Design a binder for this molecule. Structure first.
Ligand code: NA
Length: 424
């Protein structure tokens, strides 16, 4: 009588709804635009449902795969990472006069009342966490659409990198950001992330920042309706990304934080302790139509924790390092200044600040930059032109190889001054 969570890919809204009523299916999540739903049912009903060939494409069990720069109040001079990409703050004098692009952030939520974020916070922000949250195990989650308060703290850190405009300064200090909450206090579902991408794209956010990664199992050798891999989620996520592209939104994704060359299939399978036959992928970072951002340290070298590889990394931005911590131990690291040199200062969920590191802190820098580029050159109708400008004129050309840095480390000063070429 065991009832489990199944991910289902269906063929048609009208026939699916009709089938739901006929078999009284308990649909606990649904994304009409992608033809995917999550249904809670017995293994016996899951198997019978897989036999409705006119309506059901795939079914699999859902799994656990996842501007003041100089006043005495300014912390801008401590933001080494922000200084590095802006020519020490000079790029803030070249910002577009009107900052109309909306940056969507899909993450844990945000402290909307943080002093550095409140002016840029958009009330169009939405909660995608359903009533009762992860697998119905968090009754405090009411499914309230406007509740985007951050419980974990990560989303607040990310938002600061794109939009802080107070003591701390983000990459795009005059642009509004929209938070799409996909975490309660527990885990997230890739289906919630997919719905958040669709929502962001429908809300007109032309830049969508995804700091969440996950290693997903998919098996292209199996074509059965009822599957053992995570096919439905994979499809939902790639379809969400392509949906965003059709709506003229760019999706920016963080590379993973496991320091692995994603071309080494063996090392990837090891992330899910998987022995099938059988492939593991880092998603959405390795998916089609995503800008994949790797992380660099304070010396512009690739962070030791950053994933990388050919046909993966598109660009890199400062995300920090723990080299000093590993070399000198905790005591010397926090008390002799090293933490401050190799970690990223960002906005914290306590209304103050915190030092962190990771690709999730590099990615918002790139998202912010794309928002600036779209507004500066008026590329709203052709957002791919923003990506090409970023790649060809918005990075440093001192970083190599491509398999590690992609087109290079982000340089916002260069990206904003393409019309102001200087003869050398
Ligand atoms: Na301008």
């Amino acid at each position: 009588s065991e009832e489990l969570y199944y991910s289902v890919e269906y063929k048609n809204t009208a026939t699916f709804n009709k089938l739901v009523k006929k078999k009284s299916l308990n649909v606990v999540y649904n994304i009409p635009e992608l033809h995917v739903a999550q249904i809670k049912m017995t293994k016996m009903h899951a198997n019978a449902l897989a036999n409705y060939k006119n309506d059901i494409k795939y079914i699999n069990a859902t799994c656990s795969t996842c501007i003041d720069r100089t006043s005495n109040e300014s912390l801008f001079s401590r933001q080494w990472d922000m200084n590095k990409i802006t020519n020490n703050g000079a790029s803030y004098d070249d910002l577009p006069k009107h900052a109309n692009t909306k940056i969507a952030i899909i993450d844990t939520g945000v402290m909307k009342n943080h002093d550095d974020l409140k002016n840029n916070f958009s009330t169009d922000s939405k909660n995608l966490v359903p009533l009762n949250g992860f697998r119905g195990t968090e009754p405090e989650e009411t499914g309230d659409v406007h509740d985007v308060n951050d419980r974990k703290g990560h989303g607040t850190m990310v938002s600061g990198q794109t939009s802080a405009n107070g003591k701390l300064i983000g990459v795009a200090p005059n642009n509004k950001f929209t938070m799409y909450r996909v975490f309660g206090s527990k885990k997230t579902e890739l289906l919630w992330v997919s719905k958040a991408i669709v929502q962001a794209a429908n809300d007109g956010n032309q830049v969508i920042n995804i700091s969440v990664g996950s290693y997903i199992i998919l098996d292209k050798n199996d074509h059965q309706t009822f599957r053992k891999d995570e096919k439905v989620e994979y499809d939902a996520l790639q379809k969400a990304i392509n949906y965003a592209k059709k709506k003229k939104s760019i999706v920016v994704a963080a590379a993973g934080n496991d320091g692995i060359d994603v071309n080494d299939k063996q090392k990837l399978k090891l992330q899910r302790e998987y022995q099938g036959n059988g492939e593991v992928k880092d998603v959405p970072a390795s998916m089609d139509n995503v800008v994949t951002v790797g992380s660099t340290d304070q010396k512009s070298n690739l962070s030791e924790f950053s994933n990388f590889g050919m046909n993966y990394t598109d660009i890199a931005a400062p995300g920090g390092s723990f080299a000093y911590l590993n070399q000198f131990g905790v005591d010397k690291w926090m008390n002799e200044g090293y933490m401050h040199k190799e970690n990223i200062l960002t906005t914290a969920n306590n209304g103050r600040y915190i030092y962190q590191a990771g690709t999730s802190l590099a990615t918002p820098k790139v998202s912010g930059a794309l928002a600036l580029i779209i507004d500066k050159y008026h590329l709203e109708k052709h957002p791919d032109k923003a990506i090409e400008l970023l790649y060809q004129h918005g990075t440093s050309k001192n970083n190599k190889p491509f398999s590690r840095y992609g087109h290079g480390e982000l340089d916002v000063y260069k990206a904003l001054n393409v019309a102001n070429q200087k003869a050398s």
